[PDB]
Amino acid sequence: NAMLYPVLTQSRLLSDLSGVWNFKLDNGKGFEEKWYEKPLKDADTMPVPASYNDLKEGTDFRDHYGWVFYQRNISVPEYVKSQRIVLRCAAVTHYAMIYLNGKLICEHKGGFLPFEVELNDDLQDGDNLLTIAVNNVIDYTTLPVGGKANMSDKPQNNPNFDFFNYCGITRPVKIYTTPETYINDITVTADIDFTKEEPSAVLNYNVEIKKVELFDEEGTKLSETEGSEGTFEISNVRLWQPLNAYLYKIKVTAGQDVYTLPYGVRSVRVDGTKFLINEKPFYFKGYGKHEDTFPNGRGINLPMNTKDISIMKWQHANSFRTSHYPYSEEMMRLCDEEGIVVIDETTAVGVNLQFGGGANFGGERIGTFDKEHGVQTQEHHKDVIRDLISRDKNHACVVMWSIANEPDSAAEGAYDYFKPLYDLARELDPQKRPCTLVSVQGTTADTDCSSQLSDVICLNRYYGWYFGGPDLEVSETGLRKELSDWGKLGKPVMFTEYGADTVSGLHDTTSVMYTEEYQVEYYEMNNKVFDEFDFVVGEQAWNFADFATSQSLLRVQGNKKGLFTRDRKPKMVAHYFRNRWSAIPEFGYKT
Amino acid sequence: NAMLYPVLTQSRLLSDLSGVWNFKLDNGKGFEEKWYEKPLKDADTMPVPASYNDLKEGTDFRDHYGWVFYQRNISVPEYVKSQRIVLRCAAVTHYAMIYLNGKLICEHKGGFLPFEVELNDDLQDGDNLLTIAVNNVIDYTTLPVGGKANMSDKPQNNPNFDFFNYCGITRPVKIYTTPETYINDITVTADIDFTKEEPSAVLNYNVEIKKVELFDEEGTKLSETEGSEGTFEISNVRLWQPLNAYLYKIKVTAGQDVYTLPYGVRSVRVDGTKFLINEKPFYFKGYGKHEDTFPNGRGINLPMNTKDISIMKWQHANSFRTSHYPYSEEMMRLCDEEGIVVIDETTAVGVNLQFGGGANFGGERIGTFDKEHGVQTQEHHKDVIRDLISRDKNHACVVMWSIANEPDSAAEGAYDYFKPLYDLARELDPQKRPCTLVSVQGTTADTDCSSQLSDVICLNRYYGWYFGGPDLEVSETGLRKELSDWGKLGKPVMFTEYGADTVSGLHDTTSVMYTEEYQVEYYEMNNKVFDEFDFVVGEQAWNFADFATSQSLLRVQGNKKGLFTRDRKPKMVAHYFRNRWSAIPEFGYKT
Amino acid sequence: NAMLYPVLTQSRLLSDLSGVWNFKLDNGKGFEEKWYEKPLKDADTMPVPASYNDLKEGTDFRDHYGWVFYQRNISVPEYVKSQRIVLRCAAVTHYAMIYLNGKLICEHKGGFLPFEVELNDDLQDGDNLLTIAVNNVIDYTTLPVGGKANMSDKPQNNPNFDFFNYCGITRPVKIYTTPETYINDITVTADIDFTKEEPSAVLNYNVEIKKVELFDEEGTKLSETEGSEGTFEISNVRLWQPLNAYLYKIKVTAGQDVYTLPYGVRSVRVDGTKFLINEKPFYFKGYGKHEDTFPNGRGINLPMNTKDISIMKWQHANSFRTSHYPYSEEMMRLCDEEGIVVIDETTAVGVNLQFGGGANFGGERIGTFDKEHGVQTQEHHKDVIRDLISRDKNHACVVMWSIANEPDSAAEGAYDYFKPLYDLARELDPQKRPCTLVSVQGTTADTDCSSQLSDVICLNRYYGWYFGGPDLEVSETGLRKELSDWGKLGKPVMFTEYGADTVSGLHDTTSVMYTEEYQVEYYEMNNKVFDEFDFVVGEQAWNFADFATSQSLLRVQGNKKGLFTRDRKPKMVAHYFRNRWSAIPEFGYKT
Numbered sequence A, B, C: 001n002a003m004l005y006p007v008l009t010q011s012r013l014l015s016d017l018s019g020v021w022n023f024k025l026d027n028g029k030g031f032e033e034k035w036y037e038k039p040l041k042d043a044d045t046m047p048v049p050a051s052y053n054d055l056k057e058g059t060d061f062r063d064h065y066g067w068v069f070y071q072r073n074i075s076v077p078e079y080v081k082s083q084r085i086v087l088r089c090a091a092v093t094h095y096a097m098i099y100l101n102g103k104l105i106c107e108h109k110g111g112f113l114p115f116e117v118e119l120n121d122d123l124q125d126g127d128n129l130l131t132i133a134v135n136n137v138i139d140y141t142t143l144p145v146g147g148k149a150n151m152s153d154k155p156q157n158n159p160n161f162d163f164f165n166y167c168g169i170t171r172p173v174k175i176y177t178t179p180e181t182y183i184n185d186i187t188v189t190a191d192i193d194f195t196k197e198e199p200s201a202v203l204n205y206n207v208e209i210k211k212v213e214l215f216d217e218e219g220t221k222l223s224e225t226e227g228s229e230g231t232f233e234i235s236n237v238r239l240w241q242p243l244n245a246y247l248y249k250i251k252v253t254a255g256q257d258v259y260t261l262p263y264g265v266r267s268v269r270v271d272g273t274k275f276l277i278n279e280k281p282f283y284f285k286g287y288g289k290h291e292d293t294f295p296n297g298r299g300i301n302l303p304m305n306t307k308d309i310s311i312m313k314w315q316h317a318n319s320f321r322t323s324h325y326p327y328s329e330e331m332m333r334l335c336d337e338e339g340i341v342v343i344d345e346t347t348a349v350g351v352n353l354q355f356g357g358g359a360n361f362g363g364e365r366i367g368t369f370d371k372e373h374g375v376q377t378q379e380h381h382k383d384v385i386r387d388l389i390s391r392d393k394n395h396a397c398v399v400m401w402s403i404a405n406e407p408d409s410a411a412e413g414a415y416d417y418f419k420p421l422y423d424l425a426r427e428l429d430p431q432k433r434p435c436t437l438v439s440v441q442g443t444t445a446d447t448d449c450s451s452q453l454s455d456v457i458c459l460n461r462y463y464g465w466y467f468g469g470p471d472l473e474v475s476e477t478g479l480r481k482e483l484s485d486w487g488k489l490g491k492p493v494m495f496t497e498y499g500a501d502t503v504s505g506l507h508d509t510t511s512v513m514y515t516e517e518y519q520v521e522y523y524e525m526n527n528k529v530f531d532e533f534d535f536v537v538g539e540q541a542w543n544f545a546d547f548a549t550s551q552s553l554l555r556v557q558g559n560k561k562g563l564f565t566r567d568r569k570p571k572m573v574a575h576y577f578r579n580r581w582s583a584i585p586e587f588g589y590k591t
């Protein structure tokens, strides 16, 4: 349910278990021989946190099918078993199974959101053998979704999505402590009064448990209130803004336990064809990104996180989307301090069995939401919407939720699949932030169950690449026509993906596809049409940087639609966008 | 003096402070306004650990001169002030100044070796403001050495060495605990009896403090001895080998404190023209490397550390040198588990004022060891040899010490400068491992104070690049002649650097410098001559991968002598070496 | 003396001998064995026209020293010996020696200008063995100048200039015919009357020999005059313009011989700080180029010539300079039709013994114009100014003459060396077009013998590369100061070279030298200062495209200062200039 970001507290420790662990690829005989009971024989080395896929050589290791075993000796002091000892796994991709001294203690499905387990009971005295087994198999029951081919009898994951299936202990595995009665969750909303020309705010609060002090940026304490629930009143409040963050601090002392949380006071609501942040008409400038670096894979990369942010501010972007899964907690906290607008997105990519040849049962092609042969994820999909919104509910950076990336949202079953999730999203988000789903090419205003369920229309369109390339003038005609029609909903339309594979170094004065000149022309065509429609409130390119995918004829050593290379070096287009975004403000570009 | 690697212990905590800290570049008014007393106003963000140089945009930030301020709120629990609270800085580059709540508590010179401070006294109750200031200025008093030009009035570091002056909190800043009477140091040597065809060993031990148990790889406990000093006897001992490591474990319980250490039992001594590991004739296959990745700078990179090791084993290398500074503790422990031969090297690069135009006092060119105007580092140089050997004395991977890289070792003052350091190196190394210094081009057997002080001759030669390029046949003649002469010392000769700048992607059937074909021909010429001399016991290419340097006409976006690119992608030469090293064994290549 | 471009004529044939000839590298015994008498034994193949250097593999072939032998069987019909049979060598680099059936018939020094020989006498009946020997040795007697090192006993050319010493039959070797009394030369000037708002012109003419008809573009015949000398009067004349050429045709029928010549009527004179084409204030937009393509070397490349022109018009350039030698006749005729302003430049590069360490006779460093040990080229230098101006005197494209590229023009002897050449240049150019010399970095207004001899000041400056790089702000200060001072001559100043080596593909958001971002910043800095001075009338970047040079540490597989790669693919800077030159007109940018 509730996962608070572990951070050093007068009440709580925090011991990062990150390092080189023992590691062994599982064969068929891994569990049969209960490798978790005894130290791993003939073991290899593996850093944690990290995707393991690129950290050893050979295709058989990169493309491994199934389980791997991590193992590390753990040891707490007796003088601290007094407090309760929690194990927090920031993320294990995809499915984890945690053993201690040989006994199962936790299982988790879902490889991109945190989970924890309590250790006091089975935590012995001395060096205990911690073993985490990680499974990477994807299918019709996982988010993301594994298919049966590219989007031999040798078992083989086949992603129904266009990124590499990086797995392992993606994010840090820490340990922290907690008074036996402790702060378990905290929720903070903000009603802002833009009536006073010098606006002020009142901050609802509540603390779940099983004394509240407010400070400003510099540590200036300002007010205090007692108890579980209550309120705060701030006048001349410093509003969190895009590219101009301000974080108040919040100290919740309750019993022998105290936790601090940064918070930004910020308004967001949609109003006709206008996305309004602090009651001003916003325009998204940014991109769809990945957690993808070398050689960490999906592994958390704090230096790259900061370098990416620096490149955004250098480029005059203001937002990105957590395509196609929730990002690290550290990244979220970082865009809080840095003032980056996030579109927080779930792991629900590949809910769409039209990709490739799909799957044919009884010779008949199976539809996405066929209830016997199609996707079997809505239960898991709901837990994801639950854990995600619980984890990130307080981040001022989060301005909206993306429930799915390119689902078969114009097919039979789609509305009935997505309605309970949209409902759960608006039910659980204390700030009632707008929800959306990113619509695959092919859908229309009429046919897209997004046209009703979603507060904002988010399109992934590829006119001038997949559709119309290399003829950019013909493709522009296509883009205007489809874009016009979307205006008939009187909702905000924004593009969450559009791009063109571009191999850094390829050029021609008379451009062809894959060259840097073509990439720039492609975006000039699209951006020209975007500017013609005052209900278009955002442009986010795909992708921020080149990233790794499964191999196919259509993937030139990964996805090459980045504006920057995988090591964040600009392509010519990166300087095109920097110059365009320099003349487009965060607020009032449309009005 | 003694720095043991902090790791979770039944007796000791370990709380990694790594994360995004507050950060501010210092102007002239930083200390005058005592920024350490109050939280940093108008502050920026910066991950730790990491070099800060590449993590924000703009030359003024990359090329910053002077101080920067890191700042993080810290907080321990009262239920633990019982134990002593230590702050361990794995490395701060170059000069650190640690404040707590506004009061100085530690200073350190030397940016590549660990130091600690005790916190109990000034560690208050609640959230304490931790501030670390970092200085990057280099000169004639620092190791490495800063010069006065490339190797305006605007203050400017000018490295007297060919890598970029990456600074910041390079390595992790952790906190661990310790019973008020604790294990402060541990030393373990090994006398091995190769008389028994099934060799066995006795392991001297000693514990400095202010119960010893032995286990094997799997945790099998084998023996026990009590007290500070003592011994162990192992028969049919499993010897740590190159590319075939075996680590025993060692559990030292003393009082309420217990620490475990991995140890590999291994022999090393030189014998005429033979470098002998476990009394067998070794041959170094590997490279000189850097701690250099993007965007971490010199910052510790555990995933790359493991990926590098995988590439070595893939390439059939067996060794590298910590050019030109001690590497992270984690890396050292890793080559212990992985069986990689290390040449542990100090920060003593640029002890050589002949680089560039040098410096001219009174119009006369200043010699390196001029006692009034030359280098002023021998005092610091000794502390480095002290801290380094103390830190890494137990690593089986360490096979030798490099006291300096390319000092002016054929100049007046050189012997008198290096003798006390060589002496201190052999005095302090409990295993009496061979010592050397890496000799710059130009020195001869006759003129090099290395010919007497050093157990092994380590050459950085560039015949076919700087010297003779592009004429490889003329250059080969030069290399044979100089290499012949070195054979007259009857000592082991090995090359620690040789290479050719190569821009990945450049090619010609008829090669020119900077192409991949030239790089391969260059190494074919050199390697041919190396094979002609049975006293040559090692080949280590410069460099393992492309890395960043200061800008100059001669540096094509860094140093391009890597066999791999900065993101570890092979150049054609990498496959040349893989194929050559496949047919060269670790032992008996020479005999 | 006079070389008219051979073209099919009712009076004259033209048989192109271009093809695969026999070819043999000369060893020491080539002439001793009179290989020219008998067909080449053990011969190789070689296309003509072409530089031979890159057309076979191996450094010994590329870096060959001395002579090579071309050989082709020739054969004319008897029914045509009636007319006189001429052999025209468009260019042989450097020194040629033409044999026929074994007998010497011609010698030529100078590898970039046409020469001919008459064949009737020694032209037998049947298949005659034509043999051309080509020498590539350069030294203090050749233009360009060969030095004694980079700018073993094994003989070796060492260019005193920064391009590769490509040699062979660079340009076509044709045969044409001629009535025994024939048109040998033609000269046409134009006095233009800009008094009439609808300007008109009178065209002086003269024909040297040993009927004149005028047509317009479409073949419209307009007027006629008889005899050797005479005149033409044209009203409402269509003026040849930059980027808007108009070529009249001219049919000179004299006896049994008739030749046609295209001509553009165009005015050029300098007036204070103004370069005036057709009495309007011109501004050069373009570059310094090379005749350099793969694999032709310096060999003529008509398709690239046209592709280059297309790229100029695409980029909005209007001019280039024939750095550093006269280009092909075909190229000149092409910029006539295309309206490209040419700066016609001689082979006089490397008249400057300060490059490198120079040469030291008697231990004393030899000055450039030292009359016993220095350059010995002024005699040859005059013949070059003679042949060049004779060849290209009628090309409307030629707007100016460059007598030398970067001579030691601020040294003792310089004025006395250049005065007789400047004089000869103005004496021989019927149109009295302005003359200049391109000034190496280091010279000033005061010290440059160009400040007096030259009508226009042409600078090769590298502030922000060689001088000041990577500090572009410091370098800009330097450039303004030197540029200011040049304004004190009240003459037109233009830059004929400025640039920065840039390896296509290298990038950083925070730029370093050799990246594409640095190249663009470099030109932004320079171009900013150029715009501050209304006496600056031209910007020509070095270079149009990457080109081949001798190997050295400072040459990353050739010269990388091109805006385009060697295969004419744009670097990012090419699009920077295209966008800047789009807003700068050909006329009136300054006024």
Ligand SMILES: O=C(O)[C@H]1O[C@@H](N2CCN(C3=Nc4ccccc4Sc4ccccc43)CC2)[C@H](O)[C@@H](O)[C@@H]1O
Binding pocket: A151, A161, A162, A163, A405, A406, A441, A460, A462, A466, A467, A497, A542, A552, A554, A559, A561
């Ligand atoms: O274009 C992109 O790279 C991004 O856009 C979207 N895909 C969704 C699917 N479709 C096409 N893609 C793929 C993807 C993987 C392998 C092969 C293809 S063949 C193809 C052929 C014609 C038209 C379309 C496709 C559109 C692109 C995803 O949301 C995002 O994951 C992906 O990265």
Ligand SMILES: O=C(O)[C@H]1O[C@@H](N2CCN(C3=Nc4ccccc4Sc4ccccc43)CC2)[C@H](O)[C@@H](O)[C@@H]1O
Binding pocket: B151, B161, B162, B163, B405, B406, B441, B460, B462, B466, B467, B497, B542, B552, B554, B559, B561
């Ligand atoms: O060649 C390498 O890249 C490595 O080898 C060694 N240097 C030592 C010095 N010298 C030359 N170098 C440099 C280095 C930096 C800037 C400029 C130069 S100009 C030069 C010109 C002619 C001969 C030699 C040089 C040899 C190389 C160092 O030990 C190691 O730090 C360095 O990385």
Ligand SMILES: O=C(O)[C@H]1O[C@@H](N2CCN(C3=Nc4ccccc4Sc4ccccc43)CC2)[C@H](O)[C@@H](O)[C@@H]1O
Binding pocket: C151, C161, C162, C163, C405, C406, C441, C460, C462, C466, C467, C497, C542, C552, C554, C559, C561
């Ligand atoms: O920069 C360019 O590439 C062009 O500009 C001009 N040279 C003239 C000489 N000098 C430098 N050059 C060279 C050239 C060849 C080899 C090595 C060098 S080291 C150097 C070091 C510091 C300052 C200058 C130089 C200026 C550049 C020529 O006119 C043109 O031939 C050449 O191509």
